[PDB]
Amino acid sequence: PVHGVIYYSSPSMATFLSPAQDNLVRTYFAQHLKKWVVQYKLYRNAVTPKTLEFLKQNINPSMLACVDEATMIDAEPELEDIIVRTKLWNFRQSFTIEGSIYEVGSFKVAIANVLQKSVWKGILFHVTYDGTESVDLARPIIQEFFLKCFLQNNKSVTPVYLDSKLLLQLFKQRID
Amino acid sequence: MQELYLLGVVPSRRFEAVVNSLSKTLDGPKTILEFWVVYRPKDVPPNLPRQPDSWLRLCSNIESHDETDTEWSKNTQWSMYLEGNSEPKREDKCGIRPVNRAKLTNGSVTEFVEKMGYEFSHEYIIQGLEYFFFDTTVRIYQTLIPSQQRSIKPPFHPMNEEQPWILHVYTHVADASNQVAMAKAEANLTKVKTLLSAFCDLKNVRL
Amino acid sequence: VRMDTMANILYYPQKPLATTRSMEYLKFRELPAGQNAIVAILCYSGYNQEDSIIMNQASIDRGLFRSIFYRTYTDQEKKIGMTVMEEFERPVRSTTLRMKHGTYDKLEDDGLIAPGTRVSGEDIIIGKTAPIQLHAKRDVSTPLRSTESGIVDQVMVTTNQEGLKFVKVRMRSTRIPQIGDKFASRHGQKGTIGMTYRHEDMPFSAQGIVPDIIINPHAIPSRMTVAHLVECQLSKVSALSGFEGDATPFTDVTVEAVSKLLRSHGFQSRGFEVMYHGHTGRKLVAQVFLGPTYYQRLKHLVDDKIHARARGPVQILTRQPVEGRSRD
Amino acid sequence: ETHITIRNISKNSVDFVLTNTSLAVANSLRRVVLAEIPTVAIDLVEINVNTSVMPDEFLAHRLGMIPLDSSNIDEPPPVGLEYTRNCDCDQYCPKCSVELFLNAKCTGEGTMEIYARDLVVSSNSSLGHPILADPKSRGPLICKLRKEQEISLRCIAKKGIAKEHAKWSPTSAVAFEYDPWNKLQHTDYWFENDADAEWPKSKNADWEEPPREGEPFNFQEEPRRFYMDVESVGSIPPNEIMVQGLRILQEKLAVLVRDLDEE
Amino acid sequence: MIIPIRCFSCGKVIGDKWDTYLTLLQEDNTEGEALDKLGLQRYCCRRMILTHVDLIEKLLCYNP
Amino acid sequence: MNQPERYELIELMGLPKVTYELDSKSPNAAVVTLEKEDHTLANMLANQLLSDERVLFAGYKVPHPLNHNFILRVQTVEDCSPKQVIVDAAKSLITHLEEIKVNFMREWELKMISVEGVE
Amino acid sequence: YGVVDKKTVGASQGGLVHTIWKEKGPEICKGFFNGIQRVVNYWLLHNGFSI
Amino acid sequence: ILNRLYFFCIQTQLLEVAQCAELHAVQGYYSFPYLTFSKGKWWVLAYNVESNSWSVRLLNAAGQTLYTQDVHTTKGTLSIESFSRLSYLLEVQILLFNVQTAC
Amino acid sequence: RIRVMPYSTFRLNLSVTSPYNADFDGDEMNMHVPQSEETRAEIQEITMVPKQIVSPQSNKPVMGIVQDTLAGVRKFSLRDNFLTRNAVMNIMLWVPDWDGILP
Amino acid sequence: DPNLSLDELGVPRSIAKTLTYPETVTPYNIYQLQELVRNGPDEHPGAKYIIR
Amino acid sequence: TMIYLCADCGARNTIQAKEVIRCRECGHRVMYKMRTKRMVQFEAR
C-alpha cells in the first residue's frame, strides 16, 4: 500500500482538470501543518523544543499529531493548545494541505490544495491502491493515470509507505 | 471545562452507612483507581504561573487494571490536567474551575511532559466513590499515596489509614459564558446538598 | 561638539539650484536651508488642496527632508547648608520618596545613562538625592518628557564653581516627514503635507520621473507669485547644463530668454510636459508644469503640536487645569 | 505575432516595445515592476562601537538603500530565501535572512573613505554580495573617517517589496509613451501660439502616423503599441525584473480564480 | 553629509557616482555637462550630485 | 507616531482576501472586495473585463487610499453568473500574459547575439 | 442648460446649494457635497489640471 | 424541502437502477436540479432523462441528439436502461450517419 | 462625527473650510468631546455641520463647493466633455446612494 | 481629506486612545461593553477606568 | 565607579566618584562617557 504524495509547480488545475475528467467523485481531503515556537528559549529543538505541529489528519483519525517533530504521541485536543498556552509557545509559517479525495475504482485519488500562511504553497496529489503487490508492479502504471489526467511541474519529493503513515510523511515535506 | 464543586469530610466509621444512604438512592457504587503524576514545570523566569493547577497533572485511570500487571505505565489509559482555578469570591458557593481534560494514544505517554521537560513532583491516587446525576456527579474522595513512585502495588499511603472521606459533589460545565448551567446545576447540586445534609455537611474550600 | 538645547539639522542639504549672485557672501551655498525637490503643480486627487501639498513616499523613504532633533538636559548640584550634599547617586527604592513610573533600570552605577541607550517614554536619565529609618533620601532628579523619544547622543560631566558636579545629557531623535509637517518654498507658499502616495500612484510620466511633492494650482493666481513659477523653469534648465542658473534680483535674464534655453534640450519652451496617470496610464488631458525647486523643511513638526487632555493635573490655588505642556 | 520589439539594451536598462495588448495590462505591468518584485536589502543593524560622524540612525537608513545581488531569489531552499515573515524557523535565522558584516577601523592619519566593498557576507554564494555599479571601483560610498574612529556593525538582510519601503524595488524608473503623435487625442496640448509647433516630436515618434487629414480622426481605435523602457538599479540584472514581473503577476490573478472555483 | 546614495525620485544609485564625478568638474576640463557621461538622462536625480554640499571634509576635522 | 504599520500593507490581518456578495439591486450582479491587493490587479479585469460581450457592468474603485483594498461590481444578466464572468476573464488574462512572457524570453537572447558574444 | 460654476454651487442667493436645504432639508442634502465633491474629484483625478 | 425528499429518495432509487448499466450520473458537468445522468465507462456524449422522458440529449456543448417517450417511467429497473443502450447502439450507427452528413 | 483615521492630524472636509476662515497653513483646531448623554444630544439635533450650512446672518448658505472640486465642475460640466462607456461605470461607484441602475 | 462625508471628522487613534466619554452600563451593553474592557486601554476598541 | 573620557586627549581617566573633574597626563576639565557595549536594535528606514 505504497504512499506517494507529490508536490507540484503547476497548481489551480486540480480544481479544474479533475472535474473535467469524466469519472466519479467522493469527499474532502484537507489537513493542516501548524508550526510552533516557545515564547522563551530553552525548549528550542529536538526532544524539548520550540518546534511542534499538531497535525490535522481531518479525513480519518480526527487525531492531531501531538508531535514536537519526531516525538510520537497523538491526541484530538486542542485543549492541549491551551495547556501549552501557560505563558508559552507561538507559531511559524506552516503550510496546510487541503482538498478533494475522490472515488475512482481499483484506485482512488486524494487531492488537496496546499496553503502557506503566505496564502499559497502548491497542490499535492495521492492515489491509494491495493497493497498486496510489491511497490512498483503497477505504481508507475498508476502514474500513467498521473498522466491521465496529465499532471505537470511535479516536485521531486516522494513520501512512501493505512494512511496513518502519511502523518510522518507530512514531515517529509514539512522539513523542506 | 468549568467543574462546580464542594467538600465535606466523612469519617470512615460512618462511611459505608452513608453509602447506604447514597448508593441505594444513586448510581454506582464505582470504586476509583487512578494513578496520578502531578509533574511540576519548574521554569524560568518569574512571574511563573506557579499555581498548583499550573503544574501539570498526568492522570492515568487504571481502575480496571491489575494491581501488579506490568504493561500499565504507558499502555493503560492516561490523561493530563492543568485546569483553571476555582473562581475568586466563590464563598460557600461551589467552586468553578475550568478543566482541560486531556486524552492520549501511543506507546509513548508520559514522555511528552518530559519532552516538555517538566519535573516530577507529588503523586497520589483517586480511590473514592462516585454517584451519578446525569452530567453532574458526586465524587467522595480517597487519595492514597502510592507505595513507591510508578508502583501500582498496594498498600498505599493515606496521611492516615483512618482516612477522611473527602465527599465532593460536582458537575462539569462546557463553557461558563451562559447563565444557564450556572444556576441550573447549582440548584440541582444544592438539592444534592440537601440530600447529603440528611447525613453530611459539605462546604466550599478556596482553590 | 556644541552641547545645545533644541537643535535641528538636515540629513541631506542642497544648493538652491537657481540662486542669486549674492550668496557667495552669505556663505549660504556652504550651509543650505534648502533641498531641491522635483515639484509638480497638479490638481490630482484632492489631498493637496487650499494651500496644502502631497509628497511622494518613495522619496521620503530615501531621505527627503529627513531631519534630526537634538535636545539637551542641563543639571548642576545646588548646595546650601551648612553642608548639605546632593550627589548624582542612583535612587534606591529602599528609602527614597518619591518617584514611580521610572524606570531607573537604565542608569549606570554612576547614576547617569550611557549612550546610546534606546530611551523612550517618561524614562529617567539622572538621579538626585537630598537629606532631611529609613531616612532620608529625596529625589530632585529630572525625567524625560514623554512626547520625546530616541537614543542618547552623548553626556558631558564636568565641574562647576559653585564647587560640585555638573552634568549635561543630549539625546538625538531622527524625525521623518509625516502627514501634517510644514513645508514652504522661498516665496511664502506655506504648505502642509496632506498625503503620502507610494511611487506607482504618483503620475509617473513620461521621461518618466515622478514628482517629489505636488502643490495645487490654486495657490498661484490669487497669491500672484510668478517667481515660484520662474524658479522652476530655471531650475530645470540646470538640467543638461549644470550651469548654476543665477537668479539675481535685477538682471537682463527673462522668461522669454530661459524658454529658448528650454527646447534647447528637447522639452517644452514653457516648463510643461505630458503626464501619465498612475492608476490607468491614460495621458492627462491637461499638461503639467513639472519642474524642480527647493522647498524648505520648516520647524515645528506635528508630533510636537498634538495635545489631548482628560482629567489631568490642576493648579493648586485655582484648582483648574494646568497650561500647555507638562503632562499635559 | 508578435508582442515585443526590443531596440537597444545595456547592463542597467532594457528598451523595448509592447504590441498586441491593452492599455490596462501595460500600466499594470509598469506598476508591477516598480513595486512587488522580491529583493534582498538590509533591514536591521546592530551597532557596537561607533565614534564616527554619521549617527547610528543615519547609518541604518544609508546602509539600507545600498543594493544587493538577488538573481534567482524565488527558488528555495538555496539560491533563494522566502520572506523572513512566513518562515519555518523562529525570530531570525540564516535559513531566511543573509548576515552581513562591517568592521572598519583606521590605520592612517590622512583621511579614510569606506565604500560598499569593505562589507563581508558569509560565503554562502547566495547571494548575497552587494554590487559595484562604479567602473572598476568598489561600490557606493558609506562613510568617512579620520583618526581612531572604528565602527562595528552587524547587518542582516530580509526579503521585501517596494510597497514595504522604497528600499527594495530593484527598479529605477520606466519610460512609456503610447501614441506619440496624437491619434486618439488622449491629450489636449496647450498652444500657445501654434499647436504642432511648440511641442517636440519624440525620438519614439518616428514609428507611426496619422498626420495628413482630416480623415477625420478615428475612435473605434484603442491604444495599442506602448513604448516602454525599464531601467534597473543594478541590484538584479536588467530583467530579471521584467521576466519576474509577470511570474508574480500571473500568480496574483490565480489567487483570485482559486478563491472562487473551490467553493 | 556625503552624497545621498539613491536619488530622491528614482532608484538610480549615486553613492558610487561621485568619487568619480568630482574628478571631472575639477579634473578634466569638462562642463557641469560632463555628468552626462555617467548615465544621467533624467532630470532628475542628476540634480543630486549637482546640488550637493560636501559637508564632511569640513566636519571631519573636529577630532576628539 | 500614528503611522500605520507598513507590514500591515502586505499582510491580511485575518481578513478574507476575496469576498463575493450579491447586491440587491442590482439583480444578477455581485460585488467583489479583494484586500491588501489593489491598483494593478483591478485595472486589468476592466479594460479587459469589459471586452466580453457577456458583461453589462464593471465596477472597480478604491474607497480610500488609506485602506489597501478595492471593490468590483459586475452585472449580468442574463444567464450567468457573474462569478463566472470574471473568472473567464482572469483565465483569459494569465494565458494572455504568457503570450508575452514567452515572446520576451524568445526575443531577448535573439538580440543578445548581435552585440557580439561569443561561444 | 448651461454650465456649472461658482454661480450655482457656491453660497449664491438662489444658490443650488441653498435650494436643497430647504427642500428637502440636510440630506440627501448632506450627501450633495459628498457626491459632487466625490464624483468630480474622481473625474478630475484622471482629467488632470494644472498651470 | 419535501421536493428535496422527492428528488433524493428518487436519486437512491435510480442509483439502485444505476447499478446494472453503470450510468454514473456524475454531477460535475452541470450542477442543475435537473441533475446529470451519465454512463460507464464514459470527447463525451451526454445522457439525459427527466420526467422521466427519454431525451437522449448527447451534448458537450450540444451534440446531435435523438428522443423518445417510451414507458410510464415510474417503475424501473436495470433492464430499461439496457434498452436505453440498445437504442444507443442504433444511435452509434447514427453517429456514422453524422459522419456521412459532414460532407 | 469622529472616526477615526491614523496619522496625527485632524482630517476635515474641504467644503467646510470657508466657515473656519482658515487654510491648511499648518493651522491648529480644538476638539471638545461631550460627556453626558444629554449634551451629546444638543450638539446633534441643533448644532451640526449639516443643520449649519445656512447661517441666518444672511439667510444664505455659508458652505459650498470650493477649490479644486469647483475648478473641476466647470471643466466637466462642459458639453465638450463626453464620457466613454468605459466609465461612467468606474465613476458610478460614488453617489454614494446608488439607484443601482446605469443611466 | 476629500473622502469624508461633510459631517465627518478624522480622529487619529493616538487621541481616540485618550478621551471619553463615560457612558453608564445599560442592560443592552453589558456584553458589548465588557469586550471593550477585556481588550485594554491600549487597543482603540478598548477603555480606561471602571466606575462603581 | 566608572571610566570617563576627556574632550581633547581622550585617554582613559578612570576617575573615582566624588573627587575633582579633570585629567591626568595633560589638562582641561570636562569629559564625556564611553559608548555602552551594546548591540542596539536599529531599523534601516
Tab-separated table of C-alpha atoms in Angstrom, chain H residues 3-91:
chain	number	residue	atom	x	y	z
H	3	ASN	CA	-39.087	18.273	-3.020
H	4	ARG	CA	-35.612	17.526	-1.717
H	5	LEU	CA	-37.025	14.366	-0.211
H	6	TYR	CA	-38.615	13.571	-3.538
H	7	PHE	CA	-35.603	14.079	-5.752
H	8	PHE	CA	-33.301	12.446	-3.190
H	9	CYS	CA	-35.250	9.287	-2.496
H	10	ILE	CA	-35.697	9.036	-6.230
H	11	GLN	CA	-31.939	9.533	-6.502
H	12	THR	CA	-31.367	6.486	-4.356
H	13	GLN	CA	-33.952	4.616	-6.387
H	14	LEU	CA	-32.197	5.393	-9.636
H	15	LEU	CA	-28.833	4.627	-8.040
H	16	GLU	CA	-30.239	1.181	-7.494
H	17	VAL	CA	-31.354	1.374	-11.110
H	18	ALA	CA	-27.894	2.756	-11.932
H	19	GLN	CA	-26.239	-0.453	-10.753
H	20	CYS	CA	-26.515	-2.598	-13.857
H	21	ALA	CA	-25.755	-0.268	-16.748
H	22	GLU	CA	-23.453	1.889	-14.638
H	23	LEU	CA	-24.965	5.218	-15.592
H	24	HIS	CA	-22.906	7.068	-13.016
H	25	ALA	CA	-24.830	10.347	-13.289
H	26	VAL	CA	-21.803	12.291	-12.068
H	27	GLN	CA	-22.948	15.862	-11.479
H	28	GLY	CA	-19.794	17.831	-12.251
H	29	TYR	CA	-20.565	18.760	-15.851
H	30	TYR	CA	-23.650	20.605	-14.651
H	31	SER	CA	-24.947	21.284	-11.148
H	32	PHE	CA	-28.613	21.692	-12.096
H	33	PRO	CA	-31.625	20.349	-10.140
H	34	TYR	CA	-32.318	18.726	-13.498
H	35	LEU	CA	-29.389	16.521	-12.439
H	36	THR	CA	-26.858	14.871	-14.739
H	37	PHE	CA	-27.207	11.334	-15.951
H	38	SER	CA	-24.077	9.632	-17.270
H	39	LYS	CA	-22.571	6.258	-18.195
H	40	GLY	CA	-19.904	3.632	-17.615
H	41	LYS	CA	-17.227	3.564	-18.658
H	42	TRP	CA	-17.766	7.049	-20.017
H	43	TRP	CA	-14.730	13.599	-26.101
H	44	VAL	CA	-18.011	12.808	-24.311
H	45	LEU	CA	-21.548	12.040	-25.497
H	46	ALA	CA	-24.106	13.077	-22.884
H	47	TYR	CA	-27.137	11.249	-21.499
H	48	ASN	CA	-30.237	12.925	-20.028
H	49	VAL	CA	-33.724	11.941	-18.799
H	50	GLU	CA	-36.116	13.853	-16.521
H	51	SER	CA	-39.894	13.363	-16.471
H	52	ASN	CA	-38.682	10.642	-16.873
H	53	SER	CA	-38.567	11.377	-20.584
H	54	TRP	CA	-36.089	9.541	-22.750
H	55	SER	CA	-34.499	12.570	-24.350
H	56	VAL	CA	-31.121	11.232	-25.435
H	57	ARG	CA	-29.512	14.659	-25.299
H	58	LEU	CA	-25.890	13.858	-26.086
H	59	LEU	CA	-24.028	17.124	-25.726
H	60	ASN	CA	-20.725	18.805	-24.947
H	61	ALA	CA	-21.682	21.777	-25.753
H	62	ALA	CA	-24.526	20.108	-27.638
H	63	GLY	CA	-24.073	17.129	-29.938
H	64	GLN	CA	-26.726	15.930	-32.365
H	65	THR	CA	-29.400	14.099	-30.416
H	66	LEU	CA	-32.368	11.732	-30.504
H	67	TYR	CA	-35.542	11.499	-28.457
H	68	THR	CA	-38.202	9.056	-27.213
H	69	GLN	CA	-41.061	8.955	-24.699
H	70	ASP	CA	-41.443	5.218	-24.098
H	71	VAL	CA	-42.614	3.651	-20.818
H	72	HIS	CA	-44.631	5.157	-17.948
H	73	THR	CA	-41.234	5.879	-16.351
H	74	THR	CA	-42.125	5.377	-12.692
H	75	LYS	CA	-41.202	1.752	-12.109
H	76	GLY	CA	-37.720	0.536	-13.043
H	77	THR	CA	-35.387	-1.001	-13.440
H	78	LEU	CA	-31.992	-2.010	-14.846
H	79	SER	CA	-33.448	-3.661	-17.931
H	80	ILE	CA	-34.942	-0.397	-19.134
H	81	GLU	CA	-31.505	1.207	-19.041
H	82	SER	CA	-30.294	-1.755	-21.033
H	83	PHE	CA	-32.976	-0.826	-23.575
H	84	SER	CA	-31.618	2.703	-23.498
H	85	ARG	CA	-28.250	1.325	-24.504
H	86	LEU	CA	-29.963	-0.790	-27.152
H	87	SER	CA	-31.243	2.454	-28.596
H	88	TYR	CA	-27.808	3.954	-28.138
H	89	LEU	CA	-26.236	1.409	-30.497
H	90	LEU	CA	-28.564	2.479	-33.291
H	91	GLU	CA	-27.512	5.916	-32.108
